[PDB]
Amino acid sequence: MMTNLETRLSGADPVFARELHAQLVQALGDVKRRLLQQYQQWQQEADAIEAGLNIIEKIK
Amino acid sequence: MNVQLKKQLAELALAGTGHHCHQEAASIADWLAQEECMAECVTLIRLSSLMNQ
């Protein structure tokens, strides 16, 4: 049921965890400045990234 | 963003469906849906979300 990811975010791999979080925000910044039609697509992507950031915290 | 990161978000979404994070998983699912190569991927996430709700 549980993934390998969940166990790497639960404290067993502190470095992995902050690298993943780091790039997820990196990416978020990319699409956010991209958003300054085709906005609903990027906005959809911004939601997805932010969503992942919400889970990583709810399961760390 | 890049495929490797995307797969990490999908796994993250799948993990989320098992932690009462259906809204987050849905947001991820619909974005991945934008791609054709992730069909089944979004399928499972959604099916996992449907079964855990």
Numbering used by the authors:
A (entry chain A): 1 to 36, 42 to 65
B (entry chain C): 1 to 53
Copy the relevant paper text.
Here, we report the crystal structure of the ordered AscG1–61 region in complex with AscE at 2.4 Å resolution. Each asymmetric unit contained two molecules of AscE-AscG1–61 complex. The helices α2 (residues 14–35) and α3 (residues 44–65) of AscE formed a pair of anti-parallel helices in the AscE-AscG1–61 complex with a topology similar to those in the crystal structure of apo AscE. In contrast, when in complex with AscG1–61, this region was induced to form a two-turn helix, α1 (residues 4–12), located in a perpendicular orientation to α2, similar to that which is observed by PscE in the PscE-PscF-PscG complex. Here, we showed that the structure of AscG1–61 in the AscE-AscG1–61 complex consisted of an anti-parallel three helices bundle, with topology similar to the first on-and-a-half of the N-terminal TPR of PscG/YscG in both PscE-PscF-PscG/YscE-YscF-YscG complexes. Furthermore, in the AscE-AscG1–61 complex, only residues from the first TPR (αA, residues 3–20; and αB, residues 22–35) interacted with AscE, whereas the helix αC (residues 39–52) from the N-terminal half of the second TPR showed no points of contact with AscE. AscE residues Leu5 and Leu9 on helix α1; Leu20 and Leu24 on helix α2; and Ile54, Ile60, Ile61 and Ile64 on helix α3 formed a hydrophobic core between AscE and AscG1–61 through their interaction with AscG1–61. Leu5, Leu9 and Leu12 from helix αA, and Ile28 and Trp31 from helix αB of AscG1–61 were involved in forming the hydrophobic core with AscE. We identified that superposition of AscE-AscG1–61 had a rmsd of 1.1 Å with either PscE-PscF-PscG or YscE-YscF-YscG, suggesting that the orientation of AscE relative to AscG lies intermediate between PscE-PscF-PscG and YscE-YscF-YscG. Taking into consideration previous work in the field, we propose that AscE is required to keep the N-terminal region of AscG in a stable and ordered conformation, while the disordered C-terminal region of AscG will only be induced to fold upon interaction with the AscF substrate.
